[PDB]
Amino acid sequence: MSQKHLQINQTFEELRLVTQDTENELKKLQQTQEYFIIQYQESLRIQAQFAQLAQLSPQERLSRETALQQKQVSLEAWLQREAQTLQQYRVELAEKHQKTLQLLRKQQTIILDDELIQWKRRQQLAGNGGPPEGSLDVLQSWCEKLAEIIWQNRQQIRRAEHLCQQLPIPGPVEEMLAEVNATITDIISALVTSTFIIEKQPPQVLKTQTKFAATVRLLVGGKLNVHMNPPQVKATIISEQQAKSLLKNENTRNECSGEILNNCCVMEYHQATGTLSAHFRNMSLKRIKRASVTEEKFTVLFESQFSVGSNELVFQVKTLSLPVVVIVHGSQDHNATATVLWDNAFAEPGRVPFAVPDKVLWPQLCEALNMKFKAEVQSNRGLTKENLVFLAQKLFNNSSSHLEDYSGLSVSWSQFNRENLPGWNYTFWQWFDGVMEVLKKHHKPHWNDGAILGFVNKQQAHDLLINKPDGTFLLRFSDSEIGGITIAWKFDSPERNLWNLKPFTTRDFSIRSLADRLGDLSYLIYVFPDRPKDEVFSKYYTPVLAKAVDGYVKPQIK
């Protein structure tokens, strides 16, 4: 276990102990108050006995009167001392409650403002291919203890308040309790609202009329008996503007930007795991309301209303999903992805709904592109420092081959996916995404195997192959054709020594695969640097299969 995590567990055990201590004190204080009340009635009976001396022999009366006086004077003195003891125990209990609430405040800030935020950030980067955020198991186990400890303390101070109503003692206790109560309502509000979270986000590139899912959960749901009357959670699609004003409490009526089919779900309690979660499995976007379409951000607002405890402590919880870009056609998916990638990667913590920086530094963009690239190609072979130099030369229209020279250069959103690259009809994102699309669709094994060098220009291709045996070739990414793969090969000749074949695209690869095509060209012998062609591609050569129409009753490879 981590050291930061062990300290959290140490504090939970410390908080449990001090809450037991105030429970014991409150039981002692209830006994003192009850005994004091019996003794107060004993003082009224001394008075009643004095009135019963009216019918007594004044010789015997003298004895029974001095005795009643000695009893009254001592019981009166005891009662007065006991009254200050009751006030002192009530102050020492309020001080103890104030002390544990401050330790609980520090503990809750760690759980909610750091550990939960880290998990949410991990879930946010996972949308770009980052490593999975992991189970909410730990955050739930911690939030359960926050709920259990704040509740135990609230019911202790409700019991203390009953005692004060039963026997009021004016003084500093009344304002110490008024303060402890304010601290409790803040802790409970922050805990309830902050633990209503999306476990499984909806798709960030969302086509209308397409089934989609999301999972919301209340981390403290089982501990505060919210599972008793499981609340209905409703999902609505809202705009970036509607989200901004929603958080500033300017929601006019019930603002929304479209309709979600099957947008209602009742939370389900799972006794074994203690989890209270709404699983929306069949949501669908029926319509969307507009104001680029691929730059327009929406969010799925999940809201619910429930109360904590037998009585009415009602909470209205709201949680916004990570921004979503709504497409209708499917061809819009590529540009929508850039808007999502920029948001997921560069959102500053604590931002107002969907504010992103205009510019980032080249190494920040590199981290985002490499994370996306490996998720798309499904490989651990990502963008090397050389590949980054190639993309930096392309993006900045620079000649440097030193990655360090690009360190302090900034890429704006328009430089990434608005303005086209010099002398081209496409943006840097459209070029990079075109490479990912061609690799993902047909060449995942080839990319993983090292068979596609790709991120080299014509001059780099020339200088790598110049001193290689004839038939040495590399597969490169085409500049002129988005999603294109061109063969560069060396073969000594009078005109040129290096040659670039016409690039292939997914349409060509659907008719005949890259491996089948390379296998047909007998003049391609070595895959750069010196790997025999069949060694790298033979695994993927289509074995010619005979057909049923040609008279073959059993499958046959002809």
Ligand X SMILES: CN(C)C(=O)CCN(C(=O)[C@@H]1CCCN1C(=O)[C@@H](NC(=O)c1cc2cc(C(F)(F)P(=O)(O)O)ccc2s1)C(C)(C)C)c1ccc(-c2nccs2)cc1
Residues that bind ligand X (CB under 6 A): 478-481, 484, 486, 499-504, 508, 521
Min dist CB 401 to ligand X, Å, is 18
Closest CA to 320 of 343, 345, 291, 339: 343
For 462, the 3-state DSSP assignment is helix
Write the single-letter amino acid at 27. K
For residue 355, the Cα-to-chain-centroid distance in whole angstroms is 17
Q: Which is nearer to ligand X, 472 or 486 (CB)?
A: 486
For residue 177, the Cα-to-chain-centroid distance in whole angstroms is 37
Q: Using CB atoms within 10 A of its CB, is residue 52 exposed (0-12), middle (13-18) or buried (19+)? A: exposed
Query: Residue 529: is the preceding peptide bond cis (ω within 30°)?
Result: yes
Min dist CB 479 to ligand X, Å, is 4
The answer to whether 255 touches 313, Cβ cutoff 8 Å, is no
Q: Which residue has the tokens 């609980």?
A: 104
Q: Which is nearer to ligand X, 342 or 509 (CB)?
A: 509
Q: Which is nearer to ligand X, 121 or 462 (CB)?
A: 462
Phi and psi at 308, nearest 5°, equal -100, 135
Q: Which is nearer to ligand X, 441 or 502 (CB)?
A: 502
Half-sphere exposure (CA, 13 Å, Cβ side) for 230?
Answer: 13
Q: Which is nearer to ligand X, 240 or 437 (CB)?
A: 437
For residue 448, the Cα-to-chain-centroid distance in whole angstroms is 31
Min dist CB 383 to ligand X, Å, is 19
Min dist CB 504 to ligand X, Å, is 5
Q: Which is nearer to ligand X, 15 or 475 (CB)?
A: 475
Q: Which is nearer to ligand X, 259 or 508 (CB)?
A: 508
Half-sphere exposure (CA, 13 Å, Cβ side) for 355?
Answer: 7
Min dist CB 527 to ligand X, Å, is 17
Q: Which is nearer to ligand X, 91 or 501 (CB)?
A: 501
Min dist CB 369 to ligand X, Å, is 20
Q: Which is nearer to ligand X, 202 or 503 (CB)?
A: 503
Q: Which is nearer to ligand X, 349 or 494 (CB)?
A: 494
The answer to whether 205 touches 333, Cβ cutoff 8 Å, is yes
Min dist CB 480 to ligand X, Å, is 3
DSSP line for 158-174: HHHHHHHHHS---SSHH
Min dist CB 488 to ligand X, Å, is 7
Min dist CB 499 to ligand X, Å, is 5
Q: 228-251: string of b/e by CB count within 10 Å (b at 16+)? A: eebbebbbbbbbbebbeebeeeee
Q: Going by DSSP bridges, is the β-strand pair 297-307/264-266 parallel, antiparallel, or unpaired?
A: unpaired
Interhelix angle for 428-442 vs 362-377, to 10°?
20
Min dist CB 343 to ligand X, Å, is 31
